[PDB]
Every structure is written in structure tokens, then in C-alpha cells.
């Protein structure tokens, strides 16, 4: 049993009990978040396709952590033209655990 939802401009296919990393959500680090749009729910040969959303489908999760990702480096170079530049980046995320999915 899995379900598909949209969060952060992206779409995810999750199953009950999984840990999924998303873009940052401004919610404290201990409580429940509800995803009330579900694109499709499949439960072993019974499939519910939403047009565009499944009627009354809810996914329940629970935030686990906040943090920053791994660092990347940006390098810009122009040969024979006396130009150089460098920069670093580190991106925020949010971790949730899928608790219950039901139509």
C-alpha cells in the first residue's frame, strides 16, 4: 500500500512507516502535519486515480528533524580575460515519518 502526494513543488510516492526528506516546512520539531491532497492510492489491484485528487484521501506524517544539506562549491572562470569568482552553498531540508495513509 502506497500513495502519491505533492509537497514543495515535487511529488513523492510513500509507504506507511517510511522516512521522507522534503523542502523546509516552518513547523516545530515534534508534531503532526497533514497532507490533504493525494494524487492516487493503490492497495493491491484496487487503484484510485484522482482527477486531480482522490476524494477524501489524507496522508499523516510527523516531523523528525531540521538541518542543512551537504556543501557544494560554485566556480566561475573566464580564460584570458582576468576574471574569477567562487561561492559556497548549503540547503535546508525537513524530515518526516509517514504514520498513516487512508482514503
Amino acid at each position: 500500500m502506497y500513495a502519491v502526494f505533492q509537497s514543495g513543488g515535487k511529488q513523492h510516492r510513500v509507504s506507511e512507516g517510511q522516512t521522507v526528506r522534503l523542502e523546509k516546512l516552518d513547523i516545530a520539531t515534534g508534531e503532526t502535519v497533514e497532507f490533504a491532497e493525494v494524487l492516487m492510492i493503490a492497495n493491491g489491484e484496487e487503484v484510485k486515480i484522482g482527477v486531480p485528487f482522490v476524494d477524501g484521501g489524507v496522508i499523516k506524517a510527523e516531523v523528525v528533524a531540521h538541518g542543512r544539506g551537504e556543501k557544494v562549491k560554485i566556480v566561475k572562470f573566464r580564460r584570458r580575460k582576468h576574471y574569477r569568482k567562487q561561492q559556497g552553498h548549503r540547503q535546508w531540508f525537513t524530515d518526516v515519518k509517514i504514520t498513516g495513509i487512508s482514503a
Binding site: 494524487l39 487503484v47 482527477v51 486531480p52 560554485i74
Partner: protein, 117 residues
């Protein structure tokens, strides 16, 4: 006030020679050759963060084509008919279902065929 460059210059070179590990020959041993290698590796990485988003959409599409022709339809008619039925699933999720749930993918192909009849 005479200043000596010995201690600072050594640390400034060790930093570059550490990013060149695994390079062939003088590219991991000699500062002059290794400095150019590290700069070129950073140019490629910037360019290849854009191409990653292209090479993966190209692979999802070529994988939805093969699964749809097993069901009697082409990629272009499958994408056109899913938009007329108001389905909003993207290419990344579709290529996942095509491999792991062959029966759920057939339920989408029937959905897209009815919207074209």
C-alpha cells in the same frame, strides 16, 4: 618589520594538493599542474548540475514509451489523453509505476484511452 612568507605559503599550497587526490601523474603531485586541474573540475561540476536535470527526464520518457506500447498506445497519445482526463502525475512517478506496478499502469492507460474516445 620584515615579514616572511614561508609558513603561510605552505598552507596555501597544501589546500590545493588535497583536492586533487586520485588524479593521474603530476596532476596529484605538482602544484602548477594540479591548480589547473582543480579549477577545471569546478567548471564541469557547475555545468553538470544543469545537465543532470535533462539526462533524467530523457530517461523517464524513454521508459514510459516502452510500457505504453505494451498496452497499445504511443507516448504522445498517452500524454495528450492524460491531460484531457485531468490527471496531474509527472514523468518521474510514472516511470516508477511502470517498473514496479504493472497493473496500476494499465489502469492509467485505460483512463487515458477513455478520454480520447
Amino acid at each position: 618589520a620584515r615579514v616572511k612568507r614561508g609558513v603561510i605559503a605552505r598552507a596555501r599550497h597544501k589546500k590545493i594538493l588535497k583536492q586533487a587526490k586520485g588524479y593521474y601523474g603530476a596532476r596529484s603531485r605538482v602544484y602548477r599542474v594540479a591548480f589547473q586541474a582543480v579549477i577545471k573540475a569546478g567548471q564541469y561540476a557547475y555545468r553538470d548540475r544543469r545537465q543532470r536535470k535533462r539526462q533524467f527526464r530523457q530517461l523517464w520518457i524513454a521508459r514510459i514509451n516502452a510500457a505504453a506500447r505494451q498496452n497499445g498506445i504511443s507516448y504522445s497519445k498517452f500524454i495528450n489523453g492524460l491531460k484531457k482526463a485531468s490527471v496531474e502525475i509527472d514523468r518521474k512517478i510514472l516511470a516508477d509505476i511502470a517498473v514496479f506496478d504493472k497493473v496500476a499502469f494499465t489502469a492509467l492507460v485505460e483512463k487515458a484511452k477513455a478520454a480520447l474516445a
